Amino acid sequence: GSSGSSGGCQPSRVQAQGPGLKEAFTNKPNVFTVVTRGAGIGGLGITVEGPSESKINCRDNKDGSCSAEYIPFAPGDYDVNITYGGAHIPGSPFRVPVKDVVDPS
Numbered sequence: 001g002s003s004g005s006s007g008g009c010q011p012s013r014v015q016a017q018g019p020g021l022k023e024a025f026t027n028k029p030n031v032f033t034v035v036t037r038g039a040g041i042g043g044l045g046i047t048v049e050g051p052s053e054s055k056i057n058c059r060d061n062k063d064g065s066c067s068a069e070y071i072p073f074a075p076g077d078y079d080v081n082i083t084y085g086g087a088h089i090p091g092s093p094f095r096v097p098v099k100d101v102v103d104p105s
Contacts, residue, residue: 002072004041004042005020006041008040008042008075009039009041009042009084009085010038010039010040010084011017011039011083011084011085011087011088011089011090012039012089012090013036013037013038013039013040013072014034014035014036014039014082014084014090014092015035015087015091016032016033016034016080016088016089016092016094017032017035018032018033018076018100019030019031019032019066020032020069020070020080020096021080021094022051022096023076023096023097023099024072024097024098024099025072025098025099025100025101026073026074026075026098026099026100026101027070027071027073027101028071028072028101029061029069029071030069030070030071030072030096031057031067031068031069031070032067032068032080033038033065033067033072033081034046034065034066034067034068035065036065036066036084037064037065039098040084040085042084042085042086043085044066044082044083044084044085045081045082046058046068046080046081046082046083046085046096047080047081047082048070048072048074048078048079048080048081049078049079049080049093050074050076050077050098051074051075051076051078051082052072052073052074052076054071054072054073054078055071056068056069056070056071056104057069058101070072072098075098075099075100076098077095077097077098078095078096078098079092079093079094079095080093080096082094083091083102089101
């Protein structure tokens with residue numbers, strides 16, 4: 001396709017780590033570090049799927065990385081979907097055990 005500065009993107013060079021991927025909670029701020037130094041130059045799309053719609057919010061970093069925060073509404077096994085430009089990175093969806101801070105009496 002359109003080839004100007006780079007032939008294609010490399011969703012493999014991408015890396016995702018942090019708590020938002022290791023473990024999360026209900027109605028709690030869960031974020032993770034996304035290193036895209038080399039992958040390429042396109043449009044990233046991070047989404048979360050589960051037993052409830054989580055409030056995701058992208059965050060631009062003035063250093064050289066990407067920050068994504070999400071907050072679920074119900075406990076369960078969620079699948080953090082991540083794609084760079086138009087491909088799925090090696091590691092997603094990232095299963096994360098979403099527990100409940102406390103159950104109602």
